[model samples]
Target: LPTYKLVVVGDGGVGKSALTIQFFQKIFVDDYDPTIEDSYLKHTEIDNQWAILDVLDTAGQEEFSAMREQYMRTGDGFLIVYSVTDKASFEHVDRFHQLILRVKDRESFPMILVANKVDLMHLRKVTRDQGKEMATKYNIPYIETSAKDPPLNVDKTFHDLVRVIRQQ
Candidate 1:
């Protein structure tokens, strides 16, 4: 069976962990516990094929920047995540994706740009158009997800990234 290693990254408190946990557990968590680094492995069916999903939840703190480089080197794909409510968080997504490119030594890679916390619609500082435009510039798939909301896009995000990985 094929296995895909996916890393989720963004600034601190931007819902990286929440989105990851929601994807694996199928439930939303409101509490904020900063993740230094974590990993999860699960059997998943994507595009009608069964495979192992190796997910790495990364810390958004700058102190973990060195470790992030290592994670980027090993990942098969990446989810560049940001919360729609935080402008600073959104800004870091580009830097994260660029680092992934350098670490992997590839001009292009399998990746998806994610705008999270869409459930907080009124607090949204990053518009949908902004997210779509950024993805267009990067030439990667883009998605808006609310881990706290039902019918979450968490599954679709991972599945899409896996599909991208398979194609590459």
Candidate 2:
């Protein structure tokens, strides 16, 4: 049996919790605040696989930068999230990823760059190609998800992540 721990990291209000809720509970939360300290999730498996999808929902505050560093050190995988509608959020994704690599110093961990709020395409400040450029630059998978759009990329984000983990 293989065990896995997945931690979702990103700037506050980038839809980390919404992404988790939609993927794990099949529900969508439109209005979300990134000030949440942290949250946990458990998934049951009958195949005797030891897995814990522990979602470390860090506060989206630069003031809590130390706390975010602590969470970065304690996870097996990371989902560096950003918002397509928020250009600053997208810029922070790279900064956070670099900090995580420095803190953990672990090579070859599964990291997926998440561009959330894709449903707000009309209001998006960043283009799809820009997201792709970030993914390519970081050498990780890229996905754009809309928490408002259920039964679509909401689940695809996690599915893509799990697929990447299963490969390694």
Candidate 3:
């Protein structure tokens, strides 16, 4: 099977782990646990191609910050996530974007900007237009998702990244 390395990243409480786990688990789990393994391997089919998607979930802790470049180098595509309810988390998008560019040493790469936690729309601090504007500035697709809401685009976020990586 072809293997694609997908790195999921964002600030600590932005639901990066929740989104990643929910994508693979297909259920809403609201908790943040630091990844025990360096990466998670799951088998999936994309466009009739069976493949292994290796997902590395990186929480923005001081420890991971030190190895950000190392983790970034292994990714074929990325899901840069932020929570719509948290303004601080939303602010890290630019930092993550520049870090990815510098680590990959490329002007462009396959990536999707995710504004997660849309289930708590009542508490949303980041506007949908703001998310779209950031994506436009970075030239990446933007998706708003709520891992707590199964009917939302939790799976689409990952599937779309796989498609984008395949195209690249």
2 or 3, which is superior by lDDT?
Answer: 3
User: Where is model 3 poorest over a 10-residue stretch in terms of lDDT?
Assistant: 30-39
Give candidate 1 regions above 4 Å deviation. Answer: 31-39
Say which prediction, candidate 1 or candidate 3, comes out ahead on lDDT.
1
Where does candidate 1 have its weakest 10-residue lDDT segment? 30-39
The CA lDDT at 18 in model 3 is 81
Order candidates by lDDT, high to low: 1, 3, 2
Clash number by candidate, in order = 0, 1, 0
Candidate 3 at 66: error in angstroms? 4.0
Tens-digit lDDT track of model 3 for 1-168: 888888888888888778877777665555535455345678988788888988888867756675566679988999999999989888989988998888899998999999998888689999999999999999999999888856378778888999998887
List pairs with backbone clashes in candidate 2.
12-60
Instruction: Provide the overall lDDT of each model, using Cα atoms, as 2-decimal numbers.
Output: 0.86, 0.76, 0.84
Candidate 2 residue lDDT tens string, 1-168? 444567788888888878777766666765444356345566645235445566666667788877677777887778888988899999997787887788778655788998888878689999999999999997899987887754448655665666687777
Query: RMSD, each candidate, Å?
Result: 2.6, 3.5, 2.4
* Model 3 / residue 142 / CA error / Å: 0.5
Which tens-of-lDDT digit does each residue in 1-168 have in candidate 1? 888889988899988778887887665666544364355789978878999998888888998977687778889999999999999988887888788889888999999999998888789999999999999998999999988858468899999999998898
Q: For each candidate, what TM-score against the reference? A: 0.92, 0.82, 0.89
